[PDB]
């Protein structure tokens, strides 16, 4: 199938409470495989999936060097952005960065990403051309000028088209039994009366991987988008995910409703109804 690698960096200032915290986590699809936390007693890159443990000491040392450097650099960057927005030294602020590469089902580069945010708003992003930037405001335009002078885009393009894909393909091979295994959802429909003449049909999907899934209700074959309560897909804690979709139906009309489930793990898409 299609696969991606992402690193998620969070750098958070906390005036009066020491220097900014830097966190980095790395993912392949919905599977985290490393972390680094500058607040840890002894900050180092740590494995978070069994298949990465086989990487050698030089891998771990190199990762930790990079993340320690990031920790220092992001502290300067946070200072910089405070200034760009004429902000007081009193407030806490956050820079987030997420970057990485996407492969298609044939394993070749689909596209690269490098995106940053400040206090939860888009700040600056590498365009899909991996050559130019989109800056959100006049502050981000200052970052853009700096990054053009440092040839940052060119350096990211090299990483995204080169090492990013190489490593992702390596991880996909080393973790093939899990990373390249789609687990289909176990599904059922439950029925809960909500009154004398309405009941809740809840369509459940459990134990699936990856997290991407589509869960819909139809009445007489017609989508019930507005009437369906859809919870956010949630992690079970064993790598798998869970989701449900609920609809409130007139009592007696239950058989007019069908739950439809699409997932990569499914040999065939599912159509489910309540089975009294």
């Amino acid at each position: 199938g299609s696969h991606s690698m992402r690193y998620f960096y969070t750098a958070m200032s906390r005036p009066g409470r020491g220097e900014p915290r830097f966190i980095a986590v790395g993912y392949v699809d919905d599977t985290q495989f490393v972390r680094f936390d500058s607040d840890a007693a002894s900050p180092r890159t740590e494995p978070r999936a069994p298949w990465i443990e086989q990487e050698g000491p030089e891998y771990w040392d190199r990762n930790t060097q990079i993340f320690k450097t990031n920790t220092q650099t992001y502290r300067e960057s946070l200072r910089n952005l405070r200034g760009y927005y004429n902000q007081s030294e009193a407030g806490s602020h956050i820079i987030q960065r997420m970057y990485g590469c996407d492969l298609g089902p044939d394993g070749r580069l689909l596209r690269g990403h490098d995106q940053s945010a400040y206090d939860g708003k888009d700040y600056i992003a590498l365009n899909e051309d991996l050559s130019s930037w989109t800056a959100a405001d006049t502050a981000a335009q200052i970052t853009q000028r700096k990054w053009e002078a440092a040839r940052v885009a060119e350096q990211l393009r090299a990483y995204l088209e080169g090492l990013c894909v190489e490593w992702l393909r390596r991880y996909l091979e080393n973790g093939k039994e899990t990373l390249q295994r789609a687990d289909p959802p176990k599904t059922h429909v439950t029925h809960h009366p909500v009154s004398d003449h309405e009941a809740t049909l809840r369509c459940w999907a459990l134990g699936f991987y990856p997290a991407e899934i589509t869960l819909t209700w139809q009445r007489d074959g017609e989508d019930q988008t507005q009437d369906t309560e859809l919870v956010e897909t949630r992690p079970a804690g064993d790598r798998t995910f869970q989701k449900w979709a609920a609809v409130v139906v007139p009592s007696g009309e239950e058989q007019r409703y069908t739950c439809h489930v699409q997932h990569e793990g499914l040999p065939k898409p599912l159509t489910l109804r309540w089975e009294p």
Binding site: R62, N63, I66, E76, N80, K146, Q155, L163, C164
Partner: peptide
């Protein structure tokens, strides 16, 4: 594996 030098550039 994370990118290195490119990220060492302050915002």
């Amino acid at each position: 594996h994370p990118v290195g030098q490119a990220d060492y550039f302050e915002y």
